[PDB]
Design an enzyme around this catalytic site. Structure first.
Site, mmCIF file in Angstrom:
data_model
loop_
_atom_site.group_PDB
_atom_site.id
_atom_site.type_symbol
_atom_site.label_atom_id
_atom_site.label_comp_id
_atom_site.label_asym_id
_atom_site.label_seq_id
_atom_site.Cartn_x
_atom_site.Cartn_y
_atom_site.Cartn_z
ATOM 1 N N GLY A 260 -7.123 -16.266 28.766
ATOM 2 C CA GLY A 260 -7.549 -15.562 27.671
ATOM 3 C C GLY A 260 -8.901 -16.114 26.982
ATOM 4 C CG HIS B 237 -13.052 -10.651 34.871
ATOM 5 N ND1 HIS B 237 -11.784 -10.980 34.174
ATOM 6 C CD2 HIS B 237 -13.633 -11.958 34.770
ATOM 7 C CE1 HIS B 237 -12.010 -12.034 33.694
ATOM 8 N NE2 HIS B 237 -12.813 -12.834 33.849
ATOM 9 C CB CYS C 79 -12.593 -14.610 30.275
ATOM 10 S SG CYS C 79 -12.007 -15.818 31.697
HETATM 11 C C1 LIG Z 1 -10.375 -15.428 31.951
HETATM 12 O O1 LIG Z 1 -9.689 -15.427 30.625
HETATM 13 C C2 LIG Z 1 -9.914 -16.364 33.091
HETATM 14 C C3 LIG Z 1 -9.894 -17.939 32.407
HETATM 15 C C4 LIG Z 1 -9.566 -18.784 33.477
HETATM 16 C C5 LIG Z 1 -7.931 -18.630 33.594
HETATM 17 C C6 LIG Z 1 -7.248 -20.289 33.270
HETATM 18 N N1 LIG Z 1 -8.603 -21.104 33.106
HETATM 19 C C7 LIG Z 1 -9.697 -20.289 33.204
HETATM 20 O O2 LIG Z 1 -11.063 -20.642 32.675
HETATM 21 N N2 LIG Z 1 -10.634 -16.195 34.224
HETATM 22 C C8 LIG Z 1 -9.942 -15.661 35.205
HETATM 23 O O3 LIG Z 1 -8.611 -15.307 35.224
HETATM 24 C C9 LIG Z 1 -10.639 -15.425 36.720
HETATM 25 C C10 LIG Z 1 -10.893 -14.087 37.156
HETATM 26 C C11 LIG Z 1 -11.681 -14.003 38.139
HETATM 27 C C12 LIG Z 1 -13.125 -13.917 37.719
HETATM 28 C C13 LIG Z 1 -12.485 -12.525 38.114
HETATM 29 N N3 LIG Z 1 -10.110 -16.277 37.693
HETATM 30 C C14 LIG Z 1 -10.024 -17.596 37.562
HETATM 31 O O4 LIG Z 1 -10.189 -18.295 36.831
HETATM 32 C C15 LIG Z 1 -9.252 -18.281 38.815
HETATM 33 N N4 LIG Z 1 -10.076 -18.929 39.730
HETATM 34 C C16 LIG Z 1 -10.438 -18.426 40.947
HETATM 35 O O5 LIG Z 1 -10.084 -17.348 41.396
HETATM 36 O O6 LIG Z 1 -11.314 -19.212 41.855
HETATM 37 C C17 LIG Z 1 -11.349 -18.838 43.158
HETATM 38 C C18 LIG Z 1 -10.540 -19.574 44.244
HETATM 39 C C19 LIG Z 1 -10.384 -20.737 44.391
HETATM 40 C C20 LIG Z 1 -9.441 -21.418 45.194
HETATM 41 C C21 LIG Z 1 -8.319 -20.640 45.834
HETATM 42 C C22 LIG Z 1 -8.496 -19.157 45.377
HETATM 43 C C23 LIG Z 1 -9.533 -18.715 44.828
HETATM 44 C C24 LIG Z 1 -8.370 -19.184 38.257
HETATM 45 C C25 LIG Z 1 -6.949 -18.468 37.949
HETATM 46 C C26 LIG Z 1 -6.879 -19.173 39.171
#
Ligand SMILES: *[C@H](O)[C@H](C[C@@H]1CCNC1=O)NC(=O)[C@H](CC1CC1)NC(=O)[C@@H](NC(=O)OCc1ccccc1)C1CC1
Ligand SMILES: *[C@H](O)[C@H](C[C@@H]1CCNC1=O)NC(=O)[C@H](CC1CC1)NC(=O)[C@@H](NC(=O)OCc1ccccc1)C1CC1
Lengths: 306, 306
Positions: free
Chosen positions: B143, B41, B145
């Protein structure tokens, strides 16, 4: 989100660890520039533990008695001196992996990472804290002596701890890198007692803020309190007094959460009074006192180093 | 003695972390030989986040769109491909600090160290476990990830985890290094839930053995039980079933302490039925389940790595 007992990355310290052997004693040393630091009780025998005159024992010794393996490359010792409880071995090779570093002496309540080692090789890394009675609750076996504790500030390793000994409650005692013990302890196998410990109140409050920042709010209240009335309850529960200095370090965390420091004190007060009644905070069923206010900000803002 | 959650020393992994930027997305990558692994992503925008066809998005991309920085050194990307949920960036420079390594997929209940990173720079290291519902209870911010989880095997880093997302609950989900999620999660911001978790029974038992090895015996008893009747109790308290294979992995610890596994099971049953009644075990007021039997043996016998 999330909150873990998090150690500093250990790479810069791993590149300094060596093995030091003298007689039938092997322990760890710290190799910085052309100097190897290690516990002076490397020069003892297993019967010498009872009452050594380390000054006796050092003039006894010649440079060639000291075997200093860095890996399997053996380092020639070309001079030695004793500084308090550490021995300083001058070697004919400066460590090319020497990081930029400082020697610091820490205060009770402060935390640091320990890189536990045996035979000059790293075994694992963990946080802990200098307890108010100047012991640490570590994990150390025979052969761990010379393992060090440290903090990293961007690129610079601040060494604060070198391990020497285990006391009979299973807690550990040692020195700064200038060889002075934390606490009244001495590098001698005669009866010594830790002394009653107490809880680091300012750290417990910082952890309560970590909890709020991470979504545990079940312990908060509208209650407020004064520093002095809170401090009356701290005495009763074997908690360090809270100072205005402590209140001031907690300001940043207080402001980020919008919870006044003395309101958090009111929360802690009801926590001691009523216990926790099944609930957990940040996955713990005890009040945690081994995170400083800086540890909390460090982790909840993702500060990095290099 | 003493017992802590101890991570592996992180040096070998620190030398593989890089920064990967594409568009307005920065995250971390793992640079081994001439390949940089990171979450796919990174190619998304803040609106792709909803329901992306990563095939769509990757065809849209050119090698020069990926800025990969190793410290302040620009790594030139010369090839890319996607394997499940990870991107593989072919670069013109092989990492001179690449360690002996393997890619492993772990089972629920196994532990590993995580080296949390931001902008390619290590921020800290902590230990955790793959929960039975295939989440981890980590500490991750925006950040992070691309930070990886790993175990060490004398000299070999076994990478098992790469970070992708945080679920509501504040638990975390990710992939192995071949890009396959642990659990049923997907790398898109559609509503997903972790699933009810359970306690890793074999891990609680070796932690009780760690306690005995370290002098906590207040919980031990006369009683024994059968594996069948213990498992009736483990069901009631949301514990994983104990298998005879689990009983067999606990053999070594059983023999060192001389407490039968089924005697320790009877001890855990009374702990579950009565609680701990104000007492702690190894400094915790909860039954701890994120130490494997191997974690206990390495720590309580000081296994080293290089
Ligand atoms: C990457 O750096 C980052 C790390 C996250 C951000 C904060 N804590 C972490 O560990 N990952 C993301 O931002 C990812 C990106 C998505 C994979 C492509 N998303 C999330 O971590 C989000 N979670 C999410 O969408 O879960 C599903 C969900 C659950 C309930 C309602 C809607 C969707 C988190 C930012 C929300
Ligand atoms: C160095 O490798 C080693 C590390 C110890 C060993 C086990 N766990 C550790 O952390 N340190 C020692 O073996 C030192 C050497 C002595 C300092 C010169 N001794 C101890 O750690 C011993 N503790 C001790 O003698 O404490 C004082 C005491 C307390 C009560 C009664 C008598 C003496 C531990 C072996 C006991």
């Amino acid at each position: 989100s999330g909150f873990r007992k998090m150690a500093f990355p250990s790479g810069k310290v791993e590149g300094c660890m060596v093995q030091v052997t003298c007689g039938t004693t092997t322990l760890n040393g710290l190799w910085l520039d052309d100097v190897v630091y290690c516990p002076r009780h490397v020069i003892c025998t297993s019967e010498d533990m009872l009452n050594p005159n380390y000054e006796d024992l050092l003039i006894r010794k010649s440079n060639h008695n000291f075997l200093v393996q860095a890996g399997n490359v053996q380092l020639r010792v070309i001079g030695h001196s004793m500084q308090n409880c550490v021995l300083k071995l001058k070697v004919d090779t400066a460590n090319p992996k020497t990081p930029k570093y400082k020697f610091v002496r820490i205060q009770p309540g402060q935390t640091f990472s320990v890189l536990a080692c045996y035979n000059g090789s790293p075994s694992g890394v963990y946080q802990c804290a200098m307890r108010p009675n100047f012991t640490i609750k570590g994990s150390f076996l025979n052969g761990s002596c010379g393992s060090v504790g440290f903090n990293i500030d961007y690129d610079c390793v601040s060494f604060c701890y070198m391990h020497h000994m285990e006391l009979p409650t299973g807690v550990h005692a040692g020195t700064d890198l200038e060889g002075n013990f934390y606490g009244p302890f001495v590098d001698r196998q005669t009866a010594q007692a830790a002394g009653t410990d107490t809880t680091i109140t300012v750290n417990v409050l910082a952890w309560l803020y970590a909890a709020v920042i991470n979504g545990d709010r079940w312990f908060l209240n509208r209650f407020t309190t004064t520093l002095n009335d809170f401090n009356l309850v701290a005495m009763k529960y074997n908690y360090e007094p809270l100072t205005q200095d402590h209140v001031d370090i907690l300001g940043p965390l207080s402001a980020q959460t919008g919870i006044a420091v003395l309101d958090m004190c009111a929360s802690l007060k009801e926590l001691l009074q009523n216990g926790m009644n099944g609930r957990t905070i940040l996955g713990s069923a005890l009040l945690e006192d081994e995170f400083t206010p800086f540890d909390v900000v460090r982790q909840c803002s993702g500060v990095t180093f290099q």
